[PDB]
Amino acid sequence: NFMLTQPHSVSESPGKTLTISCTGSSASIASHYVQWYQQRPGGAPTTLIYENDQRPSEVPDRFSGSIDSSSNSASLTISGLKTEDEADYYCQSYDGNNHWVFGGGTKLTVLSQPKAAPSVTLFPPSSEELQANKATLVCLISDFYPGAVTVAWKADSSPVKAGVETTTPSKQSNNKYAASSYLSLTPEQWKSHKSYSCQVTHEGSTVEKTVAPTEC
Amino acid sequence: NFMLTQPHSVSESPGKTLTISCTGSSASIASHYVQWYQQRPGGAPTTLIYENDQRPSEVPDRFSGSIDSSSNSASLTISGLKTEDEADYYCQSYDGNNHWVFGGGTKLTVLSQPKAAPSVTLFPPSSEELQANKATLVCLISDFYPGAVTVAWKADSSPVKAGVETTTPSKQSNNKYAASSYLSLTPEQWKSHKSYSCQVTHEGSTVEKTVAPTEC
Numbered sequence: 001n002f003m004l005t006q007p008h009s010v011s012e013s014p015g016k017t018l019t020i021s022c023t024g025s026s027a028s029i030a031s032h033y034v035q036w037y038q039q040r041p042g043g044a045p046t047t048l049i050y051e052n053d054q055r056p057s058e059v060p061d062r063f064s065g066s067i068d069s070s071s072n073s074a075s076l077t078i079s080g081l082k083t084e085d086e087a088d089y090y091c092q093s094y095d096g097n098n099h100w101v102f103g104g105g106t107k108l109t110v111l112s113q114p115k116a117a118p119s120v121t122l123f124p125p126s127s128e129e130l131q132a133n134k135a136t137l138v139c140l141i142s143d144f145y146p147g148a149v150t151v152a153w154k155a156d157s158s159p160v161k162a163g164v165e166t167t168t169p170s171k172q173s174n175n176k177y178a179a180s181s182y183l184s185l186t187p188e189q190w191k192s193h194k195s196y197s198c199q200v201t202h203e204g205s206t207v208e209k210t211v212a213p214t215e216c
Numbered sequence: 217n218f219m220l221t222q223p224h225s226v227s228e229s230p231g232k233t234l235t236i237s238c239t240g241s242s243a244s245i246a247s248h249y250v251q252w253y254q255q256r257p258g259g260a261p262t263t264l265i266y267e268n269d270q271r272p273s274e275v276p277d278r279f280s281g282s283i284d285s286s287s288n289s290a291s292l293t294i295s296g297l298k299t300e301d302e303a304d305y306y307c308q309s310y311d312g313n314n315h316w317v318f319g320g321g322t323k324l325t326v327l328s329q330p331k332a333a334p335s336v337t338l339f340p341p342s343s344e345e346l347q348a349n350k351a352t353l354v355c356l357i358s359d360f361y362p363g364a365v366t367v368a369w370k371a372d373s374s375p376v377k378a379g380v381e382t383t384t385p386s387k388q389s390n391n392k393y394a395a396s397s398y399l400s401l402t403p404e405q406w407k408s409h410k411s412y413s414c415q416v417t418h419e420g421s422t423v424e425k426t427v428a429p430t431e432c
């Protein structure tokens with residue numbers, strides 16, 4: 001039935017303005033009231049926006065709500081960004097039976113350092129692995145900021161989904177993020193295809209790397 | 217100066233008995249009092265044991281602390297593991313100047329599913345990488361539970377710390393955990409050494425793979 005989708009992450013420098021979206025599925029977003037909550041790490045969530053655009057008195061005017069019926073979305077706009085705004089933000093509404101429905105949440109990053117697109121290194125199966133009748137590709141994703149990427153794999157052009165595992169991005173020692181996606185297959189599938197590809201999307205950046213069985 | 221070392225992770229089925237050890241370095245464990253704190257996931261830390269073995273009345277008698285001067289260690293024992301005992305555990309004492317000294321912390325898991333040691337797949341630098349005057353080794357760690365590991369690299373037989381980056385464990389789709397570690401070298405250092413090793417520790421069990429520079 002009805003479900004709410006939010007972006008995983010949003011970013012902006014201090015003093016500027018960003019916006020978090022909340023897109024509904026299977027039903028109109030305008031059918032029920034939409035709420036917005038801020039969740040600092042540990043502690044009670046605070047109500048920022050209720051009934052689409054009404055704001056509690058203790059919430060500053062920087063936070064505003066809106067509803068766009070054209071895109072079936074709710075929007076939380078935050079101006080005059082401060083570092084204290086760094087938190088997780090949730091949108092909430094009701095389904096057909098007036099039962100609660102929440103979004104996945106959005107990590108707000110107040111940019112403290114230069115942005116960085118990831119390095120994408122694709123590894124073919126090691127000879128040791130292939131001697132053990134096993135085959136796994138590893139897509140290493142390193143040195144990106146903020147820490148939100150989506151990975152897509154391809155075999156001989158067509159995309160694959162079965163056998164794909166992607167780890168949650170975690171921080172390296174230089175305050176940048178690292179992650180890795182891996183695709184496990186049988187050695188037959190590995191050789192029965194001309195090439196494999198791993199495609200990483202990081203905001204408006206897309207890198208795709210391609211490997212083929214070794215000829216050496 | 218004075219340091220306190222705990223195992224990284226421990227686990228056991230409900231109802232059994234488990235001991236977490238805290239070994240001191242550079243000074244005697246019997247010189248100052250030892251505390252044991254418990255941090256449940258997402259909660260505030262509380263005092264389990266203070267002054268080596270004194271127990272606050274609100275703490276169940278299933279907890280107990282001891283001191284062993286022969287091994288220069290303090291130990292927390294939990295008789296009859298309960299589900300609410302799943303938490304992080306810390307030992308704490310003082311140095312010669314009576315400043316706080318904390319152990320590294322131990323993650324305790326009450327087993328809800330079978331324990332599974334990790335698979336460790338070690339990848340050498342690809343040709344596409346060495347073509348670009350770059351070299352990265354990737355250690356893929358997958359299919360383990362509980363989700364807690366520590367990774368250590370070695371060049372030939374000496375431990376290497378510069379260039380290591382390890383990601384945090386992420387829950388795969390089969391309800392087990394995966395993680396990765398990578399070591400970034402120059403193509404000169406890769407060719408110079410005769411072998412590289414990645415050592416993964418999972419609750420006193422260690423898996424360790426080795427690769428050597430072979431042309432292609």
Ligand code: NA
Pocket residue numbers: 325326362
């Ligand atoms: Na667990």
